Design an enzyme around this catalytic site. Structure first.
Site, short mmCIF file in Angstrom:
data_model
loop_
_atom_site.label_atom_id
_atom_site.label_comp_id
_atom_site.label_asym_id
_atom_site.label_seq_id
_atom_site.Cartn_x
_atom_site.Cartn_y
_atom_site.Cartn_z
N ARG A 1 0.86 -1.18 0.00
CA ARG A 1 0.00 0.00 0.00
C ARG A 1 0.90 1.23 0.00
O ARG A 1 2.05 1.18 0.46
CB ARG A 1 -0.97 0.03 1.20
CG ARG A 1 -0.31 0.31 2.55
CD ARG A 1 -1.31 0.25 3.71
NE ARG A 1 -1.95 -1.06 3.82
CZ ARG A 1 -2.78 -1.41 4.81
NH1 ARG A 1 -3.07 -0.55 5.78
NH2 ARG A 1 -3.31 -2.63 4.83
N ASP B 1 0.26 -5.70 9.83
CA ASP B 1 -0.79 -6.56 10.37
C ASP B 1 -1.69 -7.11 9.27
O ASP B 1 -2.23 -8.20 9.41
CB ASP B 1 -1.62 -5.81 11.41
CG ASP B 1 -0.88 -5.66 12.73
OD1 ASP B 1 0.05 -6.46 12.99
OD2 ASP B 1 -1.23 -4.74 13.52
N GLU B 2 -1.85 -6.38 8.17
CA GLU B 2 -2.66 -6.86 7.05
C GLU B 2 -1.82 -7.33 5.87
O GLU B 2 -2.30 -7.37 4.74
CB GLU B 2 -3.64 -5.77 6.62
CG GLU B 2 -4.69 -5.44 7.69
CD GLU B 2 -5.74 -4.46 7.20
OE1 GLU B 2 -5.39 -3.49 6.48
OE2 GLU B 2 -6.93 -4.65 7.52
N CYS B 3 -0.55 -7.67 6.13
CA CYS B 3 0.35 -8.31 5.16
C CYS B 3 0.77 -7.40 4.01
O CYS B 3 1.31 -7.88 3.01
CB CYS B 3 -0.28 -9.60 4.61
SG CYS B 3 -0.78 -10.71 5.96
N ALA C 1 -0.22 -1.75 8.28
CA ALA C 1 0.03 -2.43 7.01
C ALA C 1 0.64 -3.80 7.24
O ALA C 1 0.25 -4.78 6.59
CB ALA C 1 0.93 -1.57 6.13
#
Ligand code: NA
Length: 304
Positions: free
Chosen positions: A199, A243-245, A241
């Protein structure tokens, strides 16, 4: 070459076939001093892994050996030129488990930018030679470089190596680049069909550079602490980020801070880059960046 497995054991990296063929090319060119065979004509010298092929290695950390100030872990120096600009060439690998995707060049006394220079070392030296020939005003040197150019071209032709600055596989790799970073050579991380893996940073590169400038130019430590606030915030965003890979975000932030070059950023870069490389299973690059940030010198030959 009998020192091949010693090269790959010391660097913990696999070297492409062009690396070894080019060594034999330089041996034939000057068997008394292969790593200096291009020095009088091009001002170039083979270094890094070539030092091992030359047996020059017989505390010794090859993660730091000829690692210039702006060399990210992806970048492995193989050739040095003009020391006034700290011109040098290196193999660029997106992953320690892959072969290099191309040969990049940087002038460490000028900037952090990594410029593509072919996908093999034959191309890289040929492109350098073509550019160097433009400056030569002496007929004997002109004759010498044309001869070397002919030998490089024929050797590349016989091995099937492209001599283009950007090949198809290189232009194909650019399709996988999730961001350029400050050095412009690009980050490649896995991204699935739901965009998981990367991201973007909340600031453009120009605005990030402006944030960095206000930190290094802060007129007191209290003002520097305040100028750090947008960086501290982005590091929180990176934790979410992670934590959500979306591991590539922290890799990009850390890389941009490293590339900016200020010692004010070594601590945060040391908190971003090792973690990101580990989460990406690029563990060797985590080792390199830790050791480089701990010892980020402007002199770097481990053979002294
Ligand atoms: Na960036």
């Amino acid at each position: 070459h009998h020192l091949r497995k010693e090269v790959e054991n010391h660097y913990k990296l696999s070297l492409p076939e062009d690396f070894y063929h080019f060594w034999k090319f330089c041996e034939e060119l000057d068997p008394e001093k292969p790593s200096d065979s291009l020095s009088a004509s091009l001002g170039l010298q083979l270094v890094g892994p070539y030092d091992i092929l030359a047996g020059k290695h017989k505390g010794l950390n090859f993660n730091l050996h000829w690692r210039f100030y702006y060399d990210p872990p992806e970048f492995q120096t193989i050739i040095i030129g003009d020391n006034k600009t700290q011109y040098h060439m290196g193999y660029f690998r997106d992953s320690p488990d892959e072969f290099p995707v191309y040969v990049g060049i940087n002038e460490a006394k000028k900037n952090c930018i990594i410029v593509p220079n072919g996908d093999n070392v034959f191309a890289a030296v040929k492109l350098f030679l073509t550019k160097k020939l433009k400056e030569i005003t002496d007929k004997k040197k002109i004759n010498l470089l044309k001869n070397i150019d002919e030998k490089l071209t024929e050797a590349a032709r016989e091995l099937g190596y492209s001599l283009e600055q950007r090949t198809v596989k290189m232009k194909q790799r650019d399709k996988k680049v999730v961001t350029k970073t400050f050095h412009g050579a690009g980050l490649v991380v896995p991204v699935d069909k739901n965009d998981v893996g990367y991201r973007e940073l909340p600031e453009t590169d120009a605005d990030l550079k402006r944030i960095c400038k206000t930190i290094v130019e802060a007129a007191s430590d209290e003002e520097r602490l305040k100028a750090f606030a947008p960086i501290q915030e982005m590091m929180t965003f990176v934790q979410f980020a992670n934590d959500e890979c979306d591991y590539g975000m922290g890799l990009e932030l850390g890389m941009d801070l490293f590339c900016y070059g200020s010692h004010y950023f070594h601590k945060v870069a040391g908190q971003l880059l090792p973690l990101a490389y580990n989460l990406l299973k690029r563990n060797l690059f985590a080792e390199i960046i830790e050791e480089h940030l701990a010892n980020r010198s402007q002199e770097n030959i481990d053979q002294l």
